[PDB]
Every structure is written in structure tokens, then in C-alpha cells.
Amino acid sequence: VHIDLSALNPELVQAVQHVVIGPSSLIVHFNEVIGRGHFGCVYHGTLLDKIHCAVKSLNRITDIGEVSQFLTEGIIMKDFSHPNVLSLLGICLRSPLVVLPYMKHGDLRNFIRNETHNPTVKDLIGFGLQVAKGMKYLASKKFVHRDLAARNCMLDEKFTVKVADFGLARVMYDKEYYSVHNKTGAKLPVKWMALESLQTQKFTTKSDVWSFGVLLWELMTRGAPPYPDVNTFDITVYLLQGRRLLQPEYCPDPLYEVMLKCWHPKAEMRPSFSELVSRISAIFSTFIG
Ligand SMILES: C[C@@H](c1cccc(-c2cnc[nH]2)c1)n1cc(-c2cc(F)cc(F)c2)c(=O)[nH]c1=O
Numbered sequence: 303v304h305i306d307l308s309a310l311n312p313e314l315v316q317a318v319q320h321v322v323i324g325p326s327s328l329i330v331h332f333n334e335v336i337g338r339g340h341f342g343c344v345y346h347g348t349l350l351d352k353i354h355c356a357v358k359s360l361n362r363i364t365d366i367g368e369v370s371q372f373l374t375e376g377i378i379m380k381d382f383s384h385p386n387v388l389s390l391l392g393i394c395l396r397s398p399l400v401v402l403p404y405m406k407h408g409d410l411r412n413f414i415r416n417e418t419h420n421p422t423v424k425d426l427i428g429f430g431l432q433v434a435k436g437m438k439y440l441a442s443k444k445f446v447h448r449d450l451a452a453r454n455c456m457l458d459e460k461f462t463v464k465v466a467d468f469g470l471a472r473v474m475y476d477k478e479y480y481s482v483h484n485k486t487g488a489k490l491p492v493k494w495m496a497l498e499s500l501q502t503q504k505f506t507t508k509s510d511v512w513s514f515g516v517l518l519w520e521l522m523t524r525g526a527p528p529y530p531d532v533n534t535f536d537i538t539v540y541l542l543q544g545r546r547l548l549q550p551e552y553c554p555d556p557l558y559e560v561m562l563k564c565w566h567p568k569a570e571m572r573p574s575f576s577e578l579v580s581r582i583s584a585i586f587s588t589f590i591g
Pocket residue numbers: 358371372373375376377379387388389390392393400402446447448449465466467468469470471472473
């Protein structure tokens with residue numbers, strides 16, 4: 303796969319040079335798969351400042367407009383610095399690669415579903431609070447995630463949760479994968495979407511708050527798939543009728559109250575990420591477990 307750099311706006315090509323990592327500074331281990339995805343796979347990699355990293359290839363990119371958006375996103379993300387947000391180490395254009403820090407304990411969904419790890423309810427509430435802190439930071443930068451889910455959060459060697467994306471939620475938002483037609487597989491993005499996002503394809507920080515509620519539900523169920531008996535074509539009407547994900551067995555009542563507030567049918571009535579951090583920190587700090 304070859305990209306015509308001359309088909310891109312030259313101003314954008316120069317503006318992204320601080321994010322660019324040259325091919326000679328990076329070795330990709332194509333036989334060491336960290337995660338396989340619809341828009342590209344994640345592999346183990348080695349970066350030269352010797353750093354162990356994760357390298358994400360972009361597989362289904364077909365037009366120069368998607369490459370322009372990829373560069374525009376690289377400029378935005380390069381500036382982010384928060385302990386609960388995955389850093390962007392850099393990008394490669396010569397097929398496009400995203401270079402991320404290596405996360406020893408992988409994605410949050412597989413971690414909480416893991417039999418050996420067995421996190422306690424308190425640990426799971428702690429992971430939820432860390433996600434809320436990363437989202438409070440992203441909301442402060444006016445950055446809309448669009449696909450916040452446990453499968454998109456990663457854990458480092460200290461069990462620090464980092465908000466991230468294994469898909470391309472902000473580049474490929476118009477693709478079939480992010481619509482109700484993606485009806486097969488575990489990663490069904492439509493089951494994390496706010497009611498207004500399902501109806502009008504509008505995504506805001508308030509629709510990320512809805513997804514955060516679904517993510518808290520995934521943490522409390524240790525990675526159960528949401529709405530198992532509701533088809534992707536029926537989720538909109540199910541939510542419009544006022545039906546919601548039920549309270550998990552180990553979920554404390556004040557945390558389910560939080561989830562119901564995240565799933566408010568009126569986006570403007572949902573709590574902010576700043577309110578979510580205060581509320582979850584108070585539940586966590588007095589928690590005995
Ligand atoms: C830095 C990280 C990250 C951290 C927190 C939130 C998000 C996010 C929210 N909604 C979409 N993404 C992404 N990250 C970045 C890219 C990436 C994508 C690009 F298109 C371009 C580019 F330079 C980097 C990626 O593929 N995966 C990933 O984890």
C-alpha cells in the first residue's frame with residue numbers, strides 16, 4: 303500500500319512533522335499480534351528514541367480524505383498528556399501506522415473476563431474512576447471519543463487504565479461498522495451509543511457520558527456483553543421505550559444510580575465527566591472490599 307503525499311494539503315503535511323516517526327526508528331513485529339481489528343491490527347513493536355511499543359496498522363483505509371483525517375487526528379492527539387489517556391508516541395506514513403506505548407495487561411474487557419486476574423468489586427470501581435478521569439481530561443480538550451467501551455481501554459504494568467481506541471472511531475465514523483448494519487461479532491459499537499447518536503448520528507461529550515455508563519455496567523458484570531438478547535436493529539426502540547441494562551449482582555446501589563443518570567433520554571440532563579469523577583471518587587473512598 304502506497305500513499306501519494308502530494309494528494310494531501312501541503313500545509314497539513316508540514317503541520318504533522320512533529321508527530322512523524324521515520325521508518326528506520328521503528329521495527330514492527332508482524333507475527334506478534336496484540337489485537338486483531340476491523341480497521342487494522344495492533345502488533346508488538348520496538349522504537350528507537352530502545353522502547354517496547356504497540357504498533358497499530360490501518361488496514362481498511364481506501365481514500366486520501368481518510369489519510370488527511372488520520373493526520374489531523376495525529377496533531378490533536380500528540381498534545382494529550384494524562385495518566386488515564388493512552389499517549390500517542392507518533393505516526394508513520396511510509397500502511398500508515400499509529401505508534402502507542404506498550405500496555406502489559408492489554409485491553410480492559412479481556413482483563414476483567416480473565417479467570418486468573420479476578421479483580422474485586424473495589425478494583426473494578428477503581429478502574430471506572432480512572433476511565434472517568436481520562437474522559438474528564440478529554441472533555442476539557444473538547445475531544446469526543448465516539449466509541450468509549452471496555453474493549454477500547456488498556457492497562458499498563460501498574461494496572462493504570464488508559465482510554466484508547468482499537469478501531470478508528472474518529473476517522474471511520476461514516477463506515478458501516480459504526481452503524482446498525484454491523485449486527486455480528488462481540489464488538490457491536492451500536493450497543494454503547496447514546497439514544498440521540500443512534501437516531502441522528504450526532505456524537506458529543508454527553509453521548510460519551512452514555513457510553514461511560516455502559517462501560518461501568520461492563521466493569522460491574524466483569525465483561526458481560528450488553529443487551530445479549532436485543533438485536534442491533536432493535537436497540538433503538540428498546541431504549542426509546544425506557545428499557546435499560548439491569549443492575550448487576552455485585553453493583554452497589556449508588557453506582558447503578560450513576561448508570562441510570564448516564565443513560566438519561568435527554569443528553570443535557572446527563573452528568574458531566576467532572577461530576578462523574580466527584581461522585582465515583584466518593585463511592586470508592588468509602589468502599590469496603
Ligand atoms: C492516542 C490513542 C487514543 C487515546 C485516547 C482516545 C483515542 C480515541 C478516541 N476516539 C478515537 N480515538 C485514541 N490512539 C490514537 C489512535 C490514532 C488514530 C488516528 F486516526 C490517528 C492517530 F494519530 C492516532 C488510534 O488508532 N488508537 C489509539 O488508541
